[PDB]
């Protein structure tokens, strides 16, 4: 009494699948397999996934469904002292869609650019080209491929910008794509999960339809088996490497979505006695299984490029947007029926990001709706005000130096923001709130207590797991740079301010809460550490 509920369970699942499954399943995982010694990478990947990844993924989902509230009120009602964790998590997600939605617009921009027999990015003789343009990927920095120059010199116009200090002109074609995106988002998150739960049916499922088509097309290409070899051929030499275990841990952590309060929010609409343990296992698996599949879709085509198109595999095998917006489209253009693959590819990229933005924004709305009945009373006006703020500020990413803006936030939005956020999530739950209570809560929901395996992971493994990542992360730290450009010192600071903006809420809200409660210190802790339940 009283909360809206899912329209039935597929909606929830596809909402969680759609959230967790995004461009990151296509553009980092397959690369890591290739780099880390292939099928061997699965060992550290799976271990990290089992001990670190799923237990944390499991945690938020159970926590969300149990406390029946958004991120802020949820931690407020769990550990009032740490209620800042809710605030931090929410505005981390708040920062993230100032940038992340630009990837979708890029996807939409290639989509409409792709409505022709002759794909613009296949040729070096165009107006935006330079004398250094190769037909395909090479080793040398100064000579870009054709697909690269289309992306940078035409779509992005990143060549006009000398850094983050010069953003240059606003591309209004790019701005139209961002707006179309927020439109799609709006009428999605329009009425809440009663609609949003419906729309994810397309956005979550569609990627698999296209993955199948590209899986079949790619494997029928000459050289496709050569690609799979680079992808999956095991070197267990890597298993002994620290960098390989760190890549496994990190990838597993960031691929599943804990720390944005999205799983918390989404699960909060579940029926109390719903089995969230079966949902957490099914959903986790599908997320990973998707990455594994997509790997074949990519490296199948990657091998084809090395075989038929004469390019060194190390040059075409890459991560980040470069893979999806340059390397892969370069291959599609050489194939017969190119236009078809192109159109469905870029729509896949779109639908891959969309259901992700849904959960991200939903984390904020649900969080604020439960804290402030004012904006709970009017949903339609709030999201309009939120997305308007997004779009206006997002005009910065539609500029000629937009990528420089994108790359800054990408690094600092939460890299370490969410890490320390989830670390305090694992600590608050397992120690402060206690595992005994937590297990008791889950039992009352699904009927049985968590296996003591999960309990150990939440208390010990997770914290050192997040620590293992955060330590090795700081150990290899180097100042922000993109390509040959090095970001200024003031820019790096602005990132740390964005990164620490969210995390600072935890200690801050603890102080303001500590000082707002009368009595002795030891008496003042106990009041703030006593759950809403008790």
């Amino acid at each position: 009494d009283e909360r809206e509920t899912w329209s039935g369970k597929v909606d929830f699942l596809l909402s969680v699948i759609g959230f967790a499954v995004d461009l990151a399943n296509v553009w980092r995982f397959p690369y890591l397999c290739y780099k880390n010694g292939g099928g061997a990478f699965l060992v550290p990947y799976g271990i990290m996934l089992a001990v670190g990844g799923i237990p944390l993924f499991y945690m938020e989902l159970a926590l969300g469904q149990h406390n029946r509230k958004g991120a802020i009120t949820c931690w407020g009602r769990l550990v009032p002292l740490f209620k800042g964790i809710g605030y931090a998590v929410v505005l981390i997600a708040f920062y993230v869609d100032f940038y992340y939605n630009v990837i979708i617009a890029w996807s939409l921009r290639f989509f409409f650019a792709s409505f022709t027999n002759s794909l613009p990015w296949t040729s070096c003789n165009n107006i935006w080209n330079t004398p250094n343009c190769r037909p395909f990927e090479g080793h040398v920095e100064g000579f870009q491929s054709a697909a690269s120059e289309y992306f940078n010199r035409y779509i992005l116009e990143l060549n006009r910008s000398e850094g983050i200090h010069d953003l240059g002109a606003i591309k209004w074609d790019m701005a139209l794509c961002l707006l179309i995106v927020y439109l799609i988002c709006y009428f999605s998150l329009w009425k809440g999960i009663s609609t949003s739960g419906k729309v994810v049916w397309f956005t979550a499922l569609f990627p698999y339809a296209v993955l199948l088509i590209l899986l079949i097309r790619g494997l029928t290409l000459p050289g496709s088996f050569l690609g799979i070899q680079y992808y999956l051929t095991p070197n267990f030499s890597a298993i002994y490497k620290a960098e390989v275990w760190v890549d496994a841990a990190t990838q597993v952590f960031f691929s599943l979505g804990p720390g944005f309060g999205v799983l918390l929010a989404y699960a909060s609409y579940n029926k109390y006695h719903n089995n969230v343990y079966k949902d957490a296992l099914l959903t986790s698996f599908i997320n990973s299984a998707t990455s594994f599949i997509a790997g074949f879709v990519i490296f199948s085509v990657l091998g084809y490029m090395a075989h038929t198109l004469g390019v060194r595999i190390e040059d075409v095998a890459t991560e980040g947007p470069g893979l999806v917006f340059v390397v892969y489209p370069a291959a599609i253009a050489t194939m017969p029926a190119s236009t078809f693959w192109a159109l469905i590819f870029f729509m896949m990229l779109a639908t891959l990001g969309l259901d992700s933005s849904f959960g991200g924004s939903e984390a904020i709305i649900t969080a604020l709706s439960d804290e402030f009945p004012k904006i709970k009373r009017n949903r339609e006006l709030f999201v309009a005000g939120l997305f308007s703020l997004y779009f206006v500020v997002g005009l910065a990413s539609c500029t000629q130096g937009g990528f420089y803006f994108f790359h800054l936030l990408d690094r600092y939005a939460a890299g370490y923001s969410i890490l320390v956020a989830v670390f305090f999530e694992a600590i608050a739950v397992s120690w402060i709130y206690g595992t005994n209570r937590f297990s008791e809560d889950i039992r009352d929901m699904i009927g049985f207590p968590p296996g003591r395996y999960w309990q150990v992971c939440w208390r010990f493994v997770a914290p050192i797991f997040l620590l293992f990542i955060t330590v090795y992360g700081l150990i290899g730290y180097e100042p922000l740079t993109y390509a040959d450009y090095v970001y200024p010192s003031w820019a790096n600071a602005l990132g740390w301010c964005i990164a620490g903006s969210s995390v600072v809420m935890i200690p801050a809200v603890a102080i303001f809460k500590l000082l707002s409660t009368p009595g002795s210190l030891r008496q003042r802790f106990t009041i703030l550490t006593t759950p809403w339940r008790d």
Partner: antibody
Amino acid sequence: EVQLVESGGGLVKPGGSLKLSCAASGFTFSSYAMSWVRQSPEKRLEWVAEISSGGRYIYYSDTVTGRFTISRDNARNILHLEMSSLRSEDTAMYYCARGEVRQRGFDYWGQGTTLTVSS
Amino acid sequence: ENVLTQSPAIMSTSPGEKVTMTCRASSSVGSSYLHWYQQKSGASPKLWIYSTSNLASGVPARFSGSGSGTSYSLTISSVEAEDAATYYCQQFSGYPLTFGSGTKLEMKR
């Protein structure tokens, strides 16, 4: 191995009140939920109330609700059922039954303790 | 409440014969939540079958159980005199928890 001993209980007059206890041993008691199940002289089993591991979740049957109160001592490993305004249809043998998992059921029962409510 | 009715109420069997008991619920019960208990005369109940198909520890394999929805059953393939008792089913599906009216198994001679 695992033992559950019900104690207290006996003759009580209608409207009267009484306290039943269950001594748990052989397992970590705090880790398992406990319920009181009773059996009338007509040999009918009726679940009375359930209490959680930490006693933070309590369920009562509609017959005993408002009268019976189930409590838990995890320090001394004792289960309690506090009865009040006892009626004559409350006459039965009261069982201390353990189970944590609903999909499992009650995997251990005590020897029972007999309550007789008569004037 | 969810009312579990059992039949027959009393049942007589010659050792070695095959016996079957039925448990019917007024409302659908999760297959995973239906359990059986054996109670010998003058003794307390013992968990016998849990989650419909699962024998508790120390339960001879001559016992089996099956069912779903509103209909469940307990079956003894070859009956032994040590099986003479009263068998109660139970639903842990939802509160209040409920026990079946019971089936009393007696030996024929």
